[PDB]
Design a protein around this ligand. Structure first.
Ligand SMILES: Nc1ncnc2c1ncn2[C@@H]1O[C@H](COP(=O)(O)OP(=O)(O)OP(=O)(O)O)[C@@H](O)[C@H]1O
Ligand SMILES: Nc1ncnc2c1ncn2[C@@H]1O[C@H](COP(=O)(O)OP(=O)(O)O)[C@@H](O)[C@H]1O
Ligand SMILES: Nc1ncnc2c1ncn2[C@@H]1O[C@H](COP(=O)(O)OP(=O)(O)O)[C@@H](O)[C@H]1O
Ligand SMILES: [Mg+2]
Ligand SMILES: [Mg+2]
Ligand SMILES: [Mg+2]
Lengths: 15, 470, 487, 39, 187, 35, 466
């Protein structure tokens, strides 16, 4: 689920 | 029958490979797996058990390896009385949404022309009621006519006027073939015929069969629709002996359709981009449209002249296939004269004093001579002006302008354009009117009284009313 | 914002994988890809290259498929994978395309987001046959006096605008589009005309200027602009007219009325010639492919008026053709002239002699004619046409000059049909022969002003009744007599 | 305000794209498992 | 006479001669013998001395036809391949010989039921995972089919695997997923 | 090449047509008043 | 990646790669040459073979010669360091002043600006040329095209425009010489050095020169226009400057493509041109544009083959321009210079709401009287002058006076005419032509309006004749 990895991790990074 | 596979699709050209039983040239093939009917007409045997074919409909959605079935015969259309009042397309399907055309016999749209011993030498004038046509280039019963003209000169209006006049003065199962022309015009003609009782939707006693392949059709359909209409007319002529009318608008498209596939059929171009086989194709199609001893076919064909050339290979090749050519000039249509027939360019094979009589022939020749003299005098007018000619030259110019106006005639089918009412002038009325204008019996009447009238009595009445008001 | 990019932009993305049917690029060059494999691809089917590019399969040959690339062939290499999409080329259609500038495939190029379109329609559909049609009766109002009076256009007609370069063809099309605002905001639904402008092979700044002009006059709210410009691939310029025609057939098939302008079809013919010559199809006249007439006829037959059983909608088509040095006799000009229902000939001599729009009334014909006019316009315009012909015969003469200088019109000023009727009345009844030809124009302006200031009743009467009554005839008679006395 | 939003969102997209690239046999395991479910 | 079409199709001079030989051998059901004999003549002509002598345009055609007759009779060749080489030397298509062989070969490759399979990956895959991959990809085929697998490696897909079985194609590379996410965020 | 000046539609064909129309409209007005 | 040459036909070279087939438009370097021979990939032929167009002469190439792939298209140095320098098609200096030390290199192949980047501002650009400013005025940030046959004055007009606009210009300027005379490039270089627009000693230079001339093989002549575009595009985008881009001659671009189109194996189109003429021209011309990131005013001289304006190349160029100045050989043989055809030159800002009702009316009246004169020309030729009316003779006289007054002496033409050049303000032009149209000078001879500036010089010359 590397797309969900992108989603979650980069959301927490941009936040 | 034989089953093959589509191996190539380029535009409207489809190469089909057969394993067993290569189909002969001109056979119809059915593409299997299509919701609508797609017919491929075999054109060439390419070797390698492959044939090249022209599609009668669009080739979108065709796949390499799609299966194709051999009909075992050329395109076969229903023929008989049951085609009257119906509209069919190139492959014989009804396109008027009125159910199947149930006939007892089908005919192949590819047939041989009548032999030399089957010809008929009888010539008899067919009076149309149009002054210029009746006088300067009369039509013949059972002859091929042909209407030449560029874009917007009046070919369609003239052919509808001829439909009206002749095909209502007729009782012999007319046929109309729409070849590569506008669909709006086809709808208009269909509803005109339904309204004027010529086509009968209920109480099926119609007297015209309709065949339509229009501009949106691929080149194969526009190249074979003329043959479909020809085949209906051929059945009416041969299988019943009836005297038939055939109205083809427009036959140039036939030739044009061929060109649009020529390069794709592997053929080196000829002159002006036409196929090398233009003349022989036109000949094999036109030699079937003929009166035999078995029956009569009076053929009226509209012939499009690209860019008003008349030396283009298609009209120039059509010229020798006709018996009375009517040439519509744009220069005359710009003078306001309608029909735009060119009096010095239209020719009939029965304009012979041993066929029509010496009075008619002399009047026609005198009209043509005075119009040619007018053409010659226009140059001297251009350089010198109209106030320097011998009084006989002014008389020639005046009578020539009067004859020009009087050659024009208001049509019944043009009441929306003109505003005037239609006129249908008999033959002797025309001859008498032009004989009197030639003799000088109306040198006192103004030239504008002869414009857009019927016989010469209407000219005198219009002159009287003009004098009263003006 | 970190919500518009992650709420559903990633949460819903169609991540599933499928078993694709593919082929392999044998060669690529000049926007043509020869592709191995793709056994079950259909003719004219849209395929997709491994770099997001799309193409159309046009040459189904035994050993390869010839694919025209809808983009730049710079991103395609030999050996790339070409996937099937299983569908014949189609574009989005619907009301959501109004106000948007899209490319030849329906992607918004105006930077306003995606078109919320749910309906898709093939670009190569067949035109309606004989039965679904009915005669052309409703008038298509251009707002141009010369057109609306002497070359009238109905709804469902194909009228060609043909002329040299910089003669005023796009100006006629844009005037016609701007004119429809009076009807598109009114209450009559069967009088609204949704417009479609197809820009083919034009400069992109020209299309930007045109969209600015359409937004100034607030004409973009009912206009779709399809743009396949000079830098777009030849397949896109080939396909733009058919995409626009599908966008208009959507309205035609739903009881609504649409208008489409193809500006211009000569550049579409050029792009089709390029595609065909690069697909190694043999050239014809002027190197054009053999079926360029079919190219334009299968397009211009899709403009039609439908009967009541099919909705009563219509699609009017105004194709544009540019001739070289006035050679109407060229290949593509004669093709399109033989196709359409009439032509509007524009001339350079007429343009520079002050006649603007430079319509050649001698050559300009409308095969539909008075069948698609209002009764008032017909009343004034039959006489105006007769007198203008008689003036051209001897170019009376003062009335003819009056009518000529009355046919002149400014740019981006489409007049209402009632004001046109009033002006042609004032000009055809003798109220303009007392004035010198030079001042006629300004009088008209003043006249219109007066009539649109204190005489809205007579204009509303002419508008509602469609014809003039002898009562209203006398009313406008006395109005124009008083104004000429005061002028 | 609108321009600021647009440019900031574009750089956010660029940064997320660049930075997910920097960031497993479980990938191949799930790939083979899904190819098993290809039917 | 009716001709027997091979299961796959090849075009050109080589494809035409290969289809001819395939039909003429499947009639006498001697496909494997002519297969091995075509490999033999390919190895023979590929040798540089003959590849230089009989591929020479400024020596007569009949002389090279006679030398080919010599080299095909001396090596105990069937009449089928014998007059096939005689036909190739008569028409002048000797240069296409290898091509014909190649064409014939791939025909037999699909007559035995051998489907090509490409498995692109970012790194050399694991051997037990490769065996499981071959096992599961066996299920994409009908009866009488065999994967001819060539798991070439491209490290630019960053992970996953791109599988092509004949013309079927699954794109499980992670780069495809990231590009789809990019297109989704931008649109 | 008879009638080729008017047929070319130049500056000389237009003036020829204008001359013919002027002369014959004058003659038509003269012939209508005497009718 | 390394490939080997397998075929050489003219400027076209086939290269076969064993691994790593280079993308289309990539630049490849031939190994074993004395100078840099760059091949640009144009087609992928199949069987791991590409077809390329050479940017230099292909003499001495041997089948099997090694070729390296650069990994990117032709990249030229872009920046303020290119100002005052001359570079060739591949960005190499040809002024013997050493390397162009920029900090960035841009590929000569780029995408055209999108639709949302287009600008709509249409302010006039006064040039001092009476016929141009009156009848077909130029616009700032617009596209100007000067059409003309051989020896009608395209180079003279473009040099006059460089003199009248580029010196008075506030931004930068780029001159792309495409397939023209090399001595003309030498003249321009040394004249710009004399006039201080190019400074050989410091960084105050305002013009960048890019030359691929008519002695160059067709590949260099086809891509040197793109090199000039790349320089101007850098100045427009990364600097935000207002750029002047002069391209003489742009037709050569198209012609160069024609010369290679046969060797690339393509079926010829009309008049033997490539089938891709219009799309190649569009790809090139759509980058020559003003965006909302910066402005580019472009002046392109367009050669007309055999004086045929219906030739596919000028006929296709006509659609890419905002203003067209069409020079005529017939007008040039009447001694009128510049040879602008006043009834064939157009502009998109010739609009009352843009140039003013006064300007618009004067221009339209001038064009009306010239069209009327042209209509009378036939009768004047055969039946002499005496067979006209009085108003026709007045029209002829005023139209001839206007024809004379449209001519003008240029400052670049001072050398071979002796007459000092004239720069006529726009208001003086409008006033003089309004006055001639009114009739205020119906008493002066027509020879008094020939080769003058303002109308005051016309009346002075009239008083000097009598
Ligand atoms: N009715 C008019 N009155 C005054 N000026 C006009 C009129 N119509 C057009 N023009 C002007 O004449 C020029 C013709 O440009 P236009 O775009 O309208 O025609 P065009 O045939 O599309 O030209 P092209 O295709 O070469 O770009 C324009 O500058 C326009 O402003
Ligand atoms: N007999 C006529 N009377 C009046 N107007 C006519 C007549 N014939 C043609 N016209 C005019 O010329 C136009 C062209 O009509 P059409 O018959 O379709 O010509 P064509 O078929 O040759 O292109 C008509 O719309 C009409 O305006
Ligand atoms: N504005 C001008 N004034 C005087 N003579 C000119 C002018 N323009 C051109 N000429 C003449 O035409 C010749 C050709 O000039 P040039 O501009 O180099 O031709 P081209 O159109 O090929 O660029 C000049 O040498 C000159 O004799
Ligand atoms: Mg017709
Ligand atoms: Mg335009
Ligand atoms: Mg020059």
């Amino acid at each position: 689920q590397k797309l969900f990895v992108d989603k979650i991790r980069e959301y927490k990074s941009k936040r | 029958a034989a089953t093959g596979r589509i191996v190539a699709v380029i535009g409207a050209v489809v190469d089909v490979q057969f394993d067993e039983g290569l189909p002969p040239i001109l056979n119809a093939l059915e593409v299997q797996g299509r919701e609508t009917r797609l017919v491929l007409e075999v054109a060439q045997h390419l070797g390698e058990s492959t044939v090249r074919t022209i599609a009668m409909d669009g080739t979108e959605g065709l796949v390499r390896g799609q299966k194709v079935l051999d009909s075992g015969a050329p395109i076969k259309i229903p023929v008989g009385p049951e085609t009257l009042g119906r509209i069919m397309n190139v492959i014989g399907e009804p396109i008027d949404e009125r159910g199947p055309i149930k006939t007892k016999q089908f005919a192949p749209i590819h047939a041989e022309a009548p032999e030399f011993m089957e010809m008929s030498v009888e010539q008899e004038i067919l009076v149309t009621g149009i002054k210029v046509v009746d006088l300067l280039a009369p039509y013949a019963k059972g002859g091929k006519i042909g209407l030449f003209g560029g874009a917007g000169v009046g070919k369609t209006v003239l052919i509808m006027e001829l439909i009206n006049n002749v095909a209502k003065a007729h009782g012999g199962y007319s046929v109309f073939a729409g070849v590569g022309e506008r669909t709006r015009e086809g709808n208009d003609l269909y509803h005109e015929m339904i309204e004027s009782g010529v086509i009968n939707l209920k109480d099926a006693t119609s007297k015209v069969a309709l065949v339509y392949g229009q501009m949106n059709e691929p080149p194969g359909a526009r190249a074979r629709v003329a043959l479909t209409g020809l085949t209906v007319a051929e059945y009416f002529r041969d299988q019943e002996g009836q005297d038939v009318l055939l109205f083809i608008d427009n036959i140039f498209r036939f030739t044009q359709a061929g060109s649009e596939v020529s390069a794709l059929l592997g053929r080196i171009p000829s002159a002006v981009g036409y196929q090398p086989t233009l003349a022989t194709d036109m000949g094999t199609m036109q030699e079937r449209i003929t009166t035999t001893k078995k029956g009569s076919i009076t053929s009226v064909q509209a012939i499009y002249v690209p860019a008003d050339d008349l030396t283009d290979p298609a009209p120039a090749t059509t010229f020798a296939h006709l018996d009375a050519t009517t040439v519509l000039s744009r220069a005359i249509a710009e003078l306001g004269i309608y029909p735009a027939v060119d009096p010095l360019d239209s020719t009939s094979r029965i304009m012979d004093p041993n066929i029509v009589g010496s009075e008619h022939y002399d009047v026609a020749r005198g009209v043509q001579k005075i119009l040619q003299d007018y053409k010659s005098l226009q140059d001297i007018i251009a350089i010198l002006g109209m106030d320097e000619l011998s009084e006989e030259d002014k008389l020639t110019v005046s009578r020539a302008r009067k004859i020009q106006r009087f050659l024009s005639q208001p049509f019944q089918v043009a009441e929306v354009f003109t505003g005037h009412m239609g006129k249908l002038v008999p033959l002797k009325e025309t001859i008498k009117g032009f004989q009197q204008i030639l003799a000088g019996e109306y040198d006192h009447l103004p030239e504008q009284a002869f414009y857009m009238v019927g016989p010469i009595e209407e000219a005198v009445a219009k002159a009287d009313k003009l004098a009263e008001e003006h | 914002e970190m919500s518009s990019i992650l709420e559903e932009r990633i949460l819903g993305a169609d991540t599933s994988v499928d078993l694709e049917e593919t082929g392999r690029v044998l060669s690529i060059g000049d926007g043509i890809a020869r592709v191995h494999g793709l056994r079950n691809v259909q003719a004219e089917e849209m395929v997709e290259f491994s770099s997001g590019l799309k193409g159309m399969s046009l040459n189904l040959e035994p050993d390869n498929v010839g694919v025209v690339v809808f983009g730049n062939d710079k991103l395609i290499k030999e050996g790339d994978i070409v996937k099937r999409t299983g569908a014949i080329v189609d574009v989005p259609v619907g009301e959501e395309l109004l106000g948007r500038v899209v490319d030849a495939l329906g992607n918004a190029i105006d930077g306003k987001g995606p078109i919320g379109s749910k309906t898709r329609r093939r670009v190569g559909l067949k035109a309606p046959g004989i039965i679904p049609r009915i005669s052309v009766r409703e008038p298509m109002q251009t707002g141009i006096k010369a057109v609306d009076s002497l070359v009238p256009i109905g709804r469902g007609q194909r009228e060609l605008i043909i002329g040299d370069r910089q003669t005023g063809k796009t100006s006629i099309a844009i005037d016609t589009i701007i004119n429809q605002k009076r009807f598109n905001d009114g209450s009559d639904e069967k009088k609204k005309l949704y417009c479609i402008y197809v820009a083919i092979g034009q400069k992109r700044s020209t299309v930007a200027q045109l969209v600015k002009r359409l937004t100034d006059a607030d004409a973009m709210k009912y206009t779709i602009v399809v743009s396949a410009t000079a830098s777009d691939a030849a397949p896109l310029q080939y396909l733009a007219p058919y995409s626009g025609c599908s966008m208009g057939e959507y309205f035609r098939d739903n009881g609504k009325h649409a208008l489409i302008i193809y500006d211009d079809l000569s550049k579409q013919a050029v792009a089709y010639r390029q595609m065909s010559l690069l697909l190694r199809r043999p050239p014809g006249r002027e190197a054009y492919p053999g079926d360029v007439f079919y190219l334009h006829s299968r397009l211009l037959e899709r403009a039609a008026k439908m009967n009541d059983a099919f909705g009563g909608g219509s699609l009017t088509a105004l194709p544009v053709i540019e001739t070289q040095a006035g050679d109407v006799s060229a290949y593509i000009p004669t093709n399109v002239i033989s196709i359409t229902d009439g032509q509007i000939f524009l001339e350079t001599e007429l343009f520079y002699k002050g006649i603007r729009p430079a319509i050649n009334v001698g050559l300009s014909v409308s095969r539909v004619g008075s069948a698609a006019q209002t009764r008032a316009m017909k009343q004034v315009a039959g006489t105006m046409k007769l007198e203008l012909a008689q003036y051209r015969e001897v170019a009376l003469l003062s009335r003819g000059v009056r009518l000529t200088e009355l046919l002149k019109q400014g740019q981006y000023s489409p007049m209402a049909i009632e004001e046109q009727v009033a002006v042609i009345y004032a000009g055809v009844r003798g109220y303009l022969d007392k004035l010198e030809p030079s001042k006629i124009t300004k009088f008209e302006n003043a006249f219109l002003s007066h009539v649109v200031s204190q005489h809205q009743a007579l204009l509303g009467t002419i508008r509602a009744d469609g014809k003039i009554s002898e009562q209203s005839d006398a009313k406008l008679k006395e109005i124009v007599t008083n104004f000429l006395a005061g002028f | 305000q609108n321009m600021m939003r647009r440019k900031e969102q574009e750089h956010m997209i660029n940064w997320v794209e660049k930075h997910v690239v920097q960031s497993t046999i479980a990938k191949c395991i799930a790939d083979l498992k899904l190819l098993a479910k290809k039917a | 006479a009716k001709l027997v079409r091979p299961p796959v199709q090849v075009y050109g001079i080589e494809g035409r001669y290969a289809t001819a030989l395939y039909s003429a051998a499947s009639k006498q059901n001697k496909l494997e013998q002519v297969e091995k004999e075509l490999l033999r003549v390919a190895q023979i002509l590929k040798e540089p001395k003959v590849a230089a002598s009989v591929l020479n345009p400024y020596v007569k055609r009949s002389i090279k036809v006679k030398s080919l007759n010599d080299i095909t009779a001396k090596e105990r060749f069937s009449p089928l391949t014998t007059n096939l080489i005689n036909l190739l030397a008569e028409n002048g298509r000797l240069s296409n010989t290898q091509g014909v062989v190649s064409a014939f070969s791939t025909m037999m490759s699909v007559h035995r039921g051998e489907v090509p399979c490409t498995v692109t990956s970012a790194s050399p895959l694991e051997e037990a995972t490769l065996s499981e991959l071959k096992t599961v990809l066996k299920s994409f085929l009908s009866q009488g089919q065999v994967l001819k697998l060539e798991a070439k490696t491209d490290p630019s897909i960053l992970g996953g695997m791109i599988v092509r079985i004949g013309e079927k194609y699954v794109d499980m590379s992670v780069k495809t997923k990231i590009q789809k996410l990019g297109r989704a965020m931008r649109e | 090449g008879a009638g080729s000046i008017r047929e070319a539609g130049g500056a000389f064909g237009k003036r020829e047509q204008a001359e013919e129309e002027r002369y014959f409209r004058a003659q038509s007005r003269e012939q209508l008043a005497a009718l």
